[PDB]
């Protein structure tokens, strides 16, 4: 199986604790279909050099297994549950998948994609092209456009579709359609796998509200943290709150939702704002004047917390989720130039992925930032991704934990 | 000497001939001050990563001498060039510089730019931070913008500034001011290297119509092509007609003008088309409706030749200037989809480097196009050049051939 045997189920209550099992995928043929006319349409900065890209991601992968990290490729995933799910479910996958097209489909185009599909092979092939995007040559016809079924491709920023939050999970309605698509497998895997079917959802794409998982943080079992930016809003935070109110196993006690610049390209919050370390947070000033912070009351505020203004600066709201004294690292350092901020924030300066508390996965690129980051005593462990950074998105990004150790706090 | 002990003198009579003497530049710190909300102004697609791009810009260096190829790196020439001028001449060109600053320099930052190029101790650190561009940061003191003259990003394209033309040069009038700032260096060089002095010139930044180097070919002996692009205008190029006719030793015969999609991403003639051997040529098929053609007599049509138009197809036109059938190998090659043809393309996938008959250095990125040179009997020597690419030009763009050998035709 893609899971390990410890693997017993959604286990994510900090975002520092030692990393057990985690969600990645491999950019495959989607990016290969990015054109310079559609970059802003599929959410990219610029076309990436596709085997240089999978090369990176590699080199990602590779340094989360030196660490005995249990990573599990989406891919493998999908295509595991779906070997192993009813011929119902198995069904509803390729029709769910043809009523969700974008562009939308012609009759006669569904039928001759549902045969294209009903032929693949292998399960791994029929997921890497449901991935992948269906142009008219794949299928054998003509047609006026090459692609018949665009491709999916952020799929590799597994952060966003879902997020992990304590032993349950929340699948994203998510704000664009070329994002939306890519919650079919989310909810494919968690409706199907023994190992993940347990598992209750705290929100689900029908819910139609926008929210996606780079502004979701999980601080520690009492407090949750999502952004209220380009992709999430405030009133979606408030049917969040709810539903975990209406959940009775589910003991988180607080939301605080975190204002952020509205910005194309750094569109999460985990672009302006990470936790890294028990008491260490890494952030852009660009942000400084921005940042505004609302609570949410998830014991004594009724069936629908409403979010309650929180007027103290970010260091002492900071401080109130944690009670011990915050630790605020800038983004380049401190004495770094304007320029300097800008460039390392733009390409996802704040955007690491804590594999234990103080010990991070980034990008090479941000040179000044990782030094900042080594000078407060986190551990940095770069890799080589420049090609994947114009996707707008680092390695927290592209991963999605599953489980990880309890912090002892 | 930067110059090899054969150089003696500006020698580029074709686009194929055995290269013997070529100028480049490695981007220096001017590429560390492109900043997210210039890159329009500044002509980059995207932010380069610094150093990963001077690695790539060695690599290229690295190729073209293992072909027995004298590399100028412009710095090291206009140092050079700096010592051996007359006291006159190194002040002026600091004059000059000031003078042509963007922004254009107050009275007081003027003077404490002067005193700061004065103070410098060597020449090359002198050239280099001419090029790279000066902060408030190096000069000390307090300003309301970080940049007190900007950064000539784009040095590292070469091309553009000045051109090889026969024994002689044209230096440009370019379209945009951040690149006309990097014609002082063309023109110190040539006005004062004993090397260069001799060499006259066709084309001056006084003359204020628009020309920029990738757009200047040299097909034969007797025929220059010129492009009418985003960047060189059919009026420039009547004006350039008249300066050869007027210089009484320049044997040239004929320009061809050749219109081109006037796209800010591929502008110039070199994004398009280009000869790569004897007979062959390669093209993008997105400018295949847009392809136009006029000539000029630079022999029979008076002082102030006219643009006459050429109503030939391509394949003939280029048939009228090598007087035998073309072979047009086509971006990504033949079968290539549209996507295909326009990410290769949008990469500078025409624009590779002829350093003899049929043999080029490119990017390894455009690996169709690579396969179709190669399939025509072409040998392409890649390099990978990612972060260089960003800038929005390839080896040709990165270099300005100063002699190459006779070509057997």
Known sequence: ???????????????????????????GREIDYITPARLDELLFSAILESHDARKEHKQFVAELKANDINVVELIDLVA???????????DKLIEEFLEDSEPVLSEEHKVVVRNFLKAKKTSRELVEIMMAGITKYDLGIEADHELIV?????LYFTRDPFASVGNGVTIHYMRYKVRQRETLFSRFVFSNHPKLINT???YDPSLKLSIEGGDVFIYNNDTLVVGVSERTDLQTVTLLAKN?????????????????????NLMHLDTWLTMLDKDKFLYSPIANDVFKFWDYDLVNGGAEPQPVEN??????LLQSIINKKPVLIPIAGEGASQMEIERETHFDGTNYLAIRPGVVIGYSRNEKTNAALEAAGIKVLP???????LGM?????????????????
Chains 1, 2 share one sequence.
């Open 1 to 27: 199986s893609v899971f390990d045997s410890k693997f017993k189920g959604i286990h994510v209550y900090s975002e520092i604790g030692e990393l057990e099992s985690v969600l990645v995928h491999e950019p």
């Open 393 to 409: 998105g680092n390695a927290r990004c592209m991963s999605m934990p599953l489980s990880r150790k309890d912090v002892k706090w």
């Open 383 to 389: 890799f080589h991704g420049n090609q994947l950074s």
């Open 311 to 316: 007027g103290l600066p970010l260091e002492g």
């Open 80 to 90: 595991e549950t779906y070997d192993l799910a009813s011929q119902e479910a198995k």
């Open 244 to 264: 975990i109110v209406a959940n009775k196993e589910c003991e988180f006690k607080r939301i605080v939702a975190i204002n952020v610049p509205k910005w194309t």
């Open 150 to 154: 665009d491709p999916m491709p952020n």
């Open 200 to 202: 209750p959802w705290y």
